[PDB]
Amino acid sequence: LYDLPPYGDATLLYFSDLHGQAFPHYFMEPPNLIAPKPLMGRPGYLTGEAILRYYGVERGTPLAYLLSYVDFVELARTFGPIGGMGALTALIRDQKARVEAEGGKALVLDGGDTWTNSGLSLLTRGEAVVRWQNLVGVDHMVSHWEWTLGRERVEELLGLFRGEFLSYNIVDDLFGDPLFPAYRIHRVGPYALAVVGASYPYVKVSHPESFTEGLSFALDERRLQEAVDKARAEGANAVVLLSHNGMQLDAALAERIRGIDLILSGHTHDLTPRPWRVGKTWIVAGSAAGKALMRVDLKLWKGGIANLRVRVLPVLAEHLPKAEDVEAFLKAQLAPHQDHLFTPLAVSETLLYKRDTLYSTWDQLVGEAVKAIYPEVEVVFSPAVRWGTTILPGQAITWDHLYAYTGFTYPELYLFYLRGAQIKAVLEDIASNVFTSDPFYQQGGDVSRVFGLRYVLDPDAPTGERVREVEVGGRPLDPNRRYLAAAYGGRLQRVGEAKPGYEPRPIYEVLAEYLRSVGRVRVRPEPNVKVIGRNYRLPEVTG
């Protein structure tokens, strides 16, 4: 709940990966987070009943509703939607006021992936999200998807952003000079707390290169270590890393970098009801889509963090007061677009979810839509991003949802031929990245969903042997056969042969065309992958 007693010298109110989600919505955690044996059972790879047990969270509680897919639909009906900028603002303000009334010091920290991927964002090229950050009063933020707006727009938006953007790693690609401050030291009574920022290191290979030309985001352990050391030389007693590296990478850094007391981990969209102790560092994840506000109270000492209290505060719009200024602001911004954004396109008869290592009902729906409009397509590759939303049974799908699921600034759907060998290699290559069993390199991640294909995955097999028994359209994969593929949200088209006469157009236009026509959809979970050595789980899709 929200009525917490005072604790410590400083309070951090942290959220991450909002992905421009302006309104209350639903967001189910993944039914599977598959890992090779060495990585199983650790934060970042917990789901379902196991995550509840790991954290000692009772089944059926508001925290259980946020934390796991177990009982999802039932709990969504019980507790209501999560997030919304209005409710998140109300909660942040409630907590900050409480802390300041106690004579405490509070900082509002945003872990990045904030400005993009929503109707509000696309309609304003991120501007409305920044204006919202300003209404709440965000002290710092880091970045990742922000860069898909392009360097020019990001700089414009940083002019508007009243908080202080941090990043030790964004440097010029020719001279190496950092473009932003690495950290900021804040007075917390008699102590000094440094907030160091880290943006996603893989922006260049993850998005169109044009968006970040002239910049390097490379993970630079030396530069990070020197930043931590410098903050301490300037008087910082404790050091907090506001990170967008991904939680597993943050855990690896905790064992390599000296002096990081706490890491606020974004990117992987994880939940950590209790902090994860790695080396001499505590790690707290930032969740996603506005579902939670992480309150981290710190008892500091001359040399670091003596102790801390972590609470995952559910952002439940039905259980929080309104932030009137935010409600009014959103009304002003979207009044002209409400018809477009909220009119039903179709009704979903069952649960549409996005997150999972391998398969989702939302991605299957997209595959069906693509094949319905382009019957020549044999395989549809959907991007396994961790942002999105969840549609409940009987709920209408709207344009706002389409933008929540497919609101890339580069949303083009591409149709192109791939040889069978390429299809298999694409999956094997992703598997090698997502599943490496070497704890030194593991970072995790999700696998592209390929509608029209079925395969067997063995996460523990050697590279080159993880993907087997591939079948396309009920027939064994023919390595030399040319198959017509479709893909959006990535770079797969670069190794294909473009379909003659086809003009790439936004995936959401294709989806809206399909949905308007069909009126109602019913996508029951029918996973197309068999996982060796694991039980593949599914949620309950009715109710």
- Per CB under 5 A, the segment of 107-115, 188-196, 271-279, 314-322 that binds Mn ion is 107-115
CA distance 508 to 522: 19
CB of 19 to Mn ion, least distance (A): 6
* CB of 150 or CB of 279, closer to Mn ion: 150
CA distance 9 to 103: 9
To the question of whether residue 207 is assigned a binding role by annotation, the answer is no
* CB of 93 or CB of 144, closer to Mn ion: 144
Is residue 363 close enough to count as binding Mn ion by CB under 5 A? no
Dihedral (CA of 148, 196, 30, 65) sign:
negative
- Per CB under 5 A, the segment of 214-222, 261-269, 421-429, 484-492 that binds Mn ion is 261-269
* CB of 445 or CB of 504, closer to Mn ion: 445
* CB of 445 or CB of 506, closer to Mn ion: 445
C-alpha R_g of the chain? 23
To the question of whether residue 172 is assigned a binding role by annotation, the answer is no
Tokens of 1: 């709940």
To the question of whether residue 339 is assigned a binding role by annotation, the answer is no
Hey, which bits of 178-324 come out as E strands? Answer: 183-188, 191-198, 215-216, 238-243, 262-265, 276-278, 281-285, 292-301, 304-314
CB of 453 to Mn ion, least distance (A): 27
- Per CB under 5 A, the segment of 4-12, 21-29, 113-121, 352-360 that binds Mn ion is 113-121
CB of 15 to Mn ion, least distance (A): 12
CB of 385 to Mn ion, least distance (A): 8
Tokens of 268: 């992987």
Please identify the residue of the shown chain whose CB is closest to the bound Mn ion: 113
* CB of 200 or CB of 483, closer to Mn ion: 200
CB of 84 to Mn ion, least distance (A): 18
Burial of 174 (0-12, 13-18, 19+ CB in 10 A): exposed
To the question of whether residue 186 is assigned a binding role by annotation, the answer is no
CA distance 335 to 127: 16
For residue 391, which of 360, 356, 423, 432 has the smallest C-alpha distance?
Answer: 360
- Per CB under 5 A, the segment of 13-21, 366-374, 408-416, 435-443 that binds Mn ion is 13-21
To the question of whether residue 337 is assigned a binding role by annotation, the answer is no
CA distance 263 to 254: 8
CA distance 27 to 347: 18
- Per CB under 5 A, the segment of 11-19, 201-209, 375-383, 399-407 that binds Mn ion is 11-19
Is residue 499 close enough to count as binding Mn ion by CB under 5 A? no
CB of 403 to Mn ion, least distance (A): 15
Is residue 144 close enough to count as binding Mn ion by CB under 5 A? yes
The number of beta carbons lying within 10 Å of the beta carbon of residue 255 is 12
First to last CA, the chain: 26
CA distance 36 to 445: 12
> Do 320 and 336 touch, CB atoms closer than 8 A?
no
CB of 10 to Mn ion, least distance (A): 26
29, 110, 113, 297: which one binds Mn ion (CB under 5 A): 113
* CB of 29 or CB of 94, closer to Mn ion: 29
What long-range pairs does 354-357 form, CB within 8 A, spacing at least 24? 354/385, 354/387, 354/388, 354/389, 354/390, 354/405, 355/28, 355/29, 355/30, 355/269, 355/386, 355/388, 355/446, 356/30, 356/31, 356/32, 356/446, 357/30, 357/32, 357/33, 357/34, 357/434, 357/446, 357/447
267, 291, 355, 449: which one binds Mn ion (CB under 5 A): 267
17, 110, 220, 297: which one binds Mn ion (CB under 5 A): 17
CA distance 196 to 232: 11
To the question of whether residue 244 is assigned a binding role by annotation, the answer is yes
* CB of 388 or CB of 496, closer to Mn ion: 388
Residue 493 DSSP code? G
Vertex 524 angle, CA 521 and 526, to 5°: 135
- Per CB under 5 A, the segment of 117-125, 136-144, 428-436, 447-455 that binds Mn ion is 136-144
* CB of 286 or CB of 496, closer to Mn ion: 286
* CB of 11 or CB of 114, closer to Mn ion: 114
To the question of whether residue 356 is assigned a binding role by annotation, the answer is no
List interacting residues with Mn ion (CB under 5 A): 17, 113, 144, 267
Which residue ranges are tagged as binding site for Mn(2+)? 17, 19, 113, 144, 244, 267, 269
Which residue ranges are tagged as binding site? 17, 19, 113, 144, 244, 267, 269
